[PDB]
Write a protein that binds this ligand. Structure first.
Ligand SMILES: [Zn+2]
Length: 33
């Protein structure tokens, strides 16, 4: 049906997280801030 999209998504790997902190835990390696 639909794609496995989540409210918090990585625009780099196309990762999907149901939790904001989980996405941040992932995208921090993209941000390096
Ligand atoms: Zn990513």
């Amino acid at each position: 049906g639909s794609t496995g999209i989540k409210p918090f998504q990585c625009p780099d790997c196309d990762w999907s997280f149901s939790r904001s902190d989980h996405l941040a835990l992932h995208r921090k390696r993209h941000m390096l801030v």
